[PDB]
Amino acid sequence: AKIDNAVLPEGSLVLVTGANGFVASHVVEQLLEHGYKVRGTARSASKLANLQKRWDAKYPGRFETAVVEDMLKQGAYDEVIKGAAGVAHIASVVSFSNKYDEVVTPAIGGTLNALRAAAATPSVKRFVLTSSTVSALIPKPNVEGIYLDEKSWNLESIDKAKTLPESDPQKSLWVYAASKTEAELAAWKFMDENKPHFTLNAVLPNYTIGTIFDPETQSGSTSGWMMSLFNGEVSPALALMPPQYYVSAVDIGLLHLGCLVLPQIERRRVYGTAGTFDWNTVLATFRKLYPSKTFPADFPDQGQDLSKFDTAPSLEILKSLGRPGWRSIEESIKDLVGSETA
């Protein structure tokens, strides 16, 4: 069909863990759009009601809500993974509670739990793990000589996370970074040690910008934070986020799709890094999209991201799916906040 030589047959069922999440909902949307059936998990059926409603109207009988309230529980995926040909693990831990052992352990645990379920389920042929650019690094404004490729690991986050004082403005970020880094490493180690019968790929998005399908419960996401600024809310938590790379929610969905069905994509770490930005380029875009609206004035210069990412597999995927190149930051932000029109 739309995708020639897709490793997963048309109409195949794909299990998407944590389908009510912001990023996950776009992965789900792209899969459904491409004719694949999806069974999305959430800690409760109610957390997926609004999205279920949306998908029932748009893709009649293609999406199914599945409940998994304890992603760490042994055998938690025994029933939901049944009949799945593909798996996109996007479910995340439940906290910003600093204790390294309390944040990192569950992260690794949830990842391996889903990986073992897939290894035990013969129907599963492809597995895509939603990681993050923090598994490679924490952004470093104005620093030259940074090039991230598939062999780049945020090794410094491990120590930084367990040594930095709680007074450090970024300790919370470092703990999160360590959790993502350790989890992805554990995922690749499991592939290397158990040699399961499925292909693994990982998508590493940076700052995802796009339409918030369900604002009711998705306002804490990256786009949720951006929408907050659009509404005039300025907070230290926001300014604490440095200049880095954005990526369209649409492209992130496409990248996951590619990792799930493209034959030429195997054992890759796919960077979701379209271009750089800072809060001032974001405000500039807001002003252009809504010329009559009042917005906060520019933030003090926060520097710029001078790093570069090896997006080879990413671009390969986008081209193969017929959506070459990254969607621009202006169109991405327009997806999120719309524009002054009538």
Describe the structure.
The protein starts with 12 loop residues before the first strand and ends in a 5-residue tail after the last helix. The protein has one domain: Rossmann fold, CATH 3.40.50. The radius of gyration is 19 Å and the shape is globular. It has a seven-stranded parallel beta sheet, with helices on both faces. Strand 2, helix 2 (about 50-60) and strand 3 form a beta-alpha-beta unit. The protein has helices at about 20-35, 50-60, 100-120, 155-165, 170-195, 215-220, 220-230, 235-240, 250-260, 280-290, 310-320, 330-335, and strands at about 15, 35-40, 65, 85-90, 125-130, 145-150, 200-205, 205-210, 245-250, 270, 275, 310. The protein is an alpha/beta fold. It is built from twelve helices and twelve strands. Helix 4 crosses helix 5 (about 170-195). Catalyzes the asymmetric reduction of o-substituted aliphatic and aromatic aldehydes and ketones to an S-enantiomer. Reduces ethyl 4-chloro-3-oxobutanoate to ethyl (S)-4-chloro-3-hydroxybutanoate. Belongs to the NAD(P)-dependent epimerase/dehydratase family. Dihydroflavonol-4-reductase subfamily. GO terms for molecular function: alcohol dehydrogenase (NADP+) activity.
